[PDB]
Amino acid sequence: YYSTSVAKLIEELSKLPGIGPKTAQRLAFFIINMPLDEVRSLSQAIIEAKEKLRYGKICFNITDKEVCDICSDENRDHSTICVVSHPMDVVAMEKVKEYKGVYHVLHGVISPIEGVGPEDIRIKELLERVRDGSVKEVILATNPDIEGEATAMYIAKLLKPFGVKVTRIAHGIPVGGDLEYTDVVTLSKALEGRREV
Template sequence: MSGLPLPLRKLTEHFASLPGIGKKTAQRLAFYLLDMPEEQAKSFADSILEAKKAIHNCKVCQNFTDKEICDICASPDRTDKIICVVEDPKDVQAFERLQEYKGQYHVLHGLISPLDGVGPEHIKIKELLQRLQTTEVDEVIMATNPTIEGEATAMYISRLLKPLQIRVSRLAFGIPVGGELEYADNVTLNKALENRMTM
């Protein structure tokens, strides 16, 4: 990036720091932004600052919202009896795209990862436990990713919930629909075998 003026280099570096953005894409975005009319660029910058100021965690489920309680928690069409525990707000959006799940969510904002210095106290587990003491819940669905950290977090929370006598379930993982067995890795194949269902 040598040869670029310092402000353009800084802008490119900011874009490159975003997840999934490489150096070439970052540079393209920076140049695109410079080609924008000033009013449009100002509107873009203002929307970033506005989102940073206005968005916070829902006091019930910890999902992002600009209100005290998010629209999902406030909806009379959702049941309080089932809570789906996810890693971050993007996971809520994935479930909402299905338009099938009618329960509530709880967003952890991370996973337990001792190697990265992230313990149970760094994510929203305490808030989940407080919520379960004030709400009558039949089932908690652990919907963390099937990674080492996701599995460890799901196991940790399920152990904490055992004394509360709430049913704890885990999302089934395995062969995707349309997938072929010969291309499945060992972990996926093993999970598919473990999660088999009676027909």
């Protein structure tokens, strides 16, 4: 029943997210049983990743270059910016192997329920990328959560002042889904925004 140096590893493991008490408890032990090196590997990593954390110059992404392989390359149109939230979104998006523009990660979303609001999210710096208006279109592709929508709903308030196209990601019926199992809200959007064949 959890001696010190352990009632903290736990205490601090169970602050990581998707890590319940259960888990911080279970997980902590496996750890004390790993061979020393392994723990030092683990530990170093947790701290090396942080000591070398590279933020993109243009797009605030987390590549290992000062300027991301996406923002470098001269085929990518630095004039359509695709807003997102997470380094991970960016990989998702590039898998559609169709995007031409460049990204702007914000590193989260605006949920006054997790510990956040405009400041902690790279919005301030997004505006400055278009302050000169040498971007034709922003594409705000966060999630269609109340997460995503907050942020988007009004990032697009702020991009009003500038001479830009502020397009939002399309909402509707996923492909390979069918109408019989689709939510009533997904459905009404799908319906009231019908893409005139």
